Chains A and B, each alone.
With several copies, the nearest count.
Chain A
Amino acid sequence: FPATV
């Protein structure tokens, strides 16, 4: 899964 903030 890609990075999110």
Chain B
Amino acid sequence: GAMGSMERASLIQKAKLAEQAERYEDMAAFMKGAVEKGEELSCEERNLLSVAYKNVVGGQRAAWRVLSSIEQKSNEEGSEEKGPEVREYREKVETELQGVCDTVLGLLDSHLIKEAGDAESRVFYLKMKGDYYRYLAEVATGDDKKRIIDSARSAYQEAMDISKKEMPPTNPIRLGLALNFSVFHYEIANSPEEAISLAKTTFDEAMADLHTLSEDSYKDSTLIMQLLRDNLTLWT
């Protein structure tokens, strides 16, 4: 580990600087270093980890989609042969993306999830596991596609089960988990009805619990509820 010689607190400090500078690859490397110190992460630190990798993989996914669209067009009737370059470069980006996913999944397996006992941490990490398997599924085309999809499903489902038992329906982690699992259903699992049912039930159960919340908690929850509504509007 290139970050092995840097203090944990310094890695966290620098991750926050990297975020301010929109240097998300650096941010992710600092946070990977912090995880590899072996101590559990605080709430703030978990969110630094997720922001960093979300931004890195988000850029890769966007690039992959551009290149995949170009590649698809190249394989239409009437398209002139341009050689192996589009496929090669799409493959390059794909391999980089898979590498980032494998890095995140590796951190979760060694050893964030096994040490996470509180619902807020455990659900957070299992949601991340589902998310990064979902990103692997987006680019999968081979013999392991079904197993990758099932890995995402299994992680999300464990997170859902804990969240329903241990968290209020307005909890932002619970809401975000449901949002993303709903998208998994729609986009990955070919289950649009399940996606819609989950988003609607999640929204409605949160609505009914808003009365319990402070002004600041209400703002946090209603933000994510609006994302559920946005997806429902897209899908209906």
A interface residue numbers (CB < 8 A to B): 2-5
- What is the CA–CA distance of A4 and B107 in the complex, to the nearest angstrom? 21
The residues of B with any CB-CB pair to A shorter than 8 Å are 131, 176, 179-180, 183, 186-187, 224, 227, 230-231, 234-235
Q: Chain B's nearest CB lies how many Å from the CB of A2? A: 5
Main secondary structure, interface of A, reads loop
Given A3-B183, A5-B176, output 11 extra A-B contacts at Cβ < 8 Å: A2-B183, A2-B186, A2-B187, A2-B230, A2-B231, A2-B234, A3-B227, A3-B231, A4-B179, A4-B183, A5-B227
Measured CB to CB, the closest approach of chain B to A4, in angstroms, equals: 5
By a CB distance below 8 angstroms, the chain A residues around B176 are 5
Going nearest first, the 10 A-B pairs with the smallest beta carbon separation are A3-B227, A5-B176, A2-B231, A4-B180, A2-B183, A4-B183, A3-B230, A3-B231, A2-B234, A5-B179
Cα separation A3 to B186 with both chains bound (whole Å) = 12
Residues of B within 8 A of A3 (CB): 179, 183, 227, 230-231
Instruction: Kindly state the separation between the CA atoms of A5 and B224 in the bound complex, as whole angstroms.
Output: 8
Q: Cβ of B183: which chain A residues have Cβ within 8 Å of it?
A: 2-4
